[PDB]
């Protein structure tokens, strides 16, 4: 029975088999979303988890600090909307401004962005922890400019 | 262990090319599976010349087989900054000098 996540993290080896089927099992109990328990739990790690997600959702996975800061799009987005989600936006090409997310299925900070920014937004998988120590250096080097 | 990617024309090269990598970046569509932050080598050929250039590269971009949008599967690898890469990012800057402006999708961003 081990399917979602709970399968793919096995499958790249990250965690054993029946370690696994405890977070299924322990999860349903809890009634907790399944990925969430494994991160909250520290099972795997943030970006074991994300290369589990993104097999899991069809969705690309990029690791930011290989990114250039000097090109990226955090000042587009409103820092209030930053506080409400814990997204990254990394980059704009025409229409699109791909925003990097820690949680595939978290559609709520798209389309607050979407509305706020009034560009078409697809989102990038970054895991948990490089959205946080990145975003607060790119707004340093973006704060470099003025206020 | 050998990645190989060959790019006929300039649009090829555009879909390809990561600008916003440090050093620069293309894009290897495969269907093997990498972690990022592996090495790798890759074989590249620009479509200026039939010189094949060996690029010693960290993986910093996956997308996966069967993902959403018609995405490609492979991997994003970043030139290894020096000489070597830099000579690449170099010779790709210039082959698509009036496209790095455009607005048109690649196979990453």
Redesign the interface.
């Given at each position: 029975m081990i399917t979602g996540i709970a399968r793919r993290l096995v499958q790249d080896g990250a965690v054993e088999e029946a370690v696994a089927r405890s977070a299924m099992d322990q999860a349903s109990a809890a009634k907790v979303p399944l990925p969430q328990w494994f991160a909250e739990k520290k099972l795997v790690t943030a970006s074991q988890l994300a290369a589990a997600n993104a097999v899991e959702f069809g969705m690309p996975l990029l690791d930011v600090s290989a990114f250039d800061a000097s090109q990226n799009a955090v000042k587009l987005v409103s820092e209030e909307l930053l506080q409400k989600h814990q997204v990254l936006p990394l980059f704009k090409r025409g229409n699109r401004l791909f925003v990097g997310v820690s949680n595939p299925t978290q559609t709520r900070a798209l389309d607050d962005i979407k509305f706020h920014t009034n560009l078409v937004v697809e989102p990038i998988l970054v895991d948990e922890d490089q959205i946080r120590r990145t975003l607060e250096q790119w707004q340093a080097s973006n704060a470099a400019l003025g206020s | 262990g050998i990645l190989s990617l060959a790019l006929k024309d300039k649009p090829a090269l555009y879909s390809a090319y990561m600008?916003?990598?440090?050093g620069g970046?293309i894009f290897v569509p495969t269907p093997k599976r990498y972690?990022?932050?592996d090495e790798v080598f890759l074989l590249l050929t620009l479509p200026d010349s039939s010189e094949r250039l060996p690029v010693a590269g960290?993986?910093?971009?996956?997308?996966?087989?069967?993902?959403?949008?018609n995405?490609a599967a492979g991997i994003?690898v970043?030139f290894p900054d020096g000489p070597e890469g830099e000579a690449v990012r170099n010779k790709i800057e210039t082959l698509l000098a009036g496209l790095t402006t455009?607005?048109?999708?690649?196979h990453?961003?």
């Open positions: - | 600008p916003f990598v440090k970046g972690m990022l932050g960290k993986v910093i971009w996956t997308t996966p087989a069967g993902a959403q949008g995405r994003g970043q455009s607005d048109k999708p690649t990453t961003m």
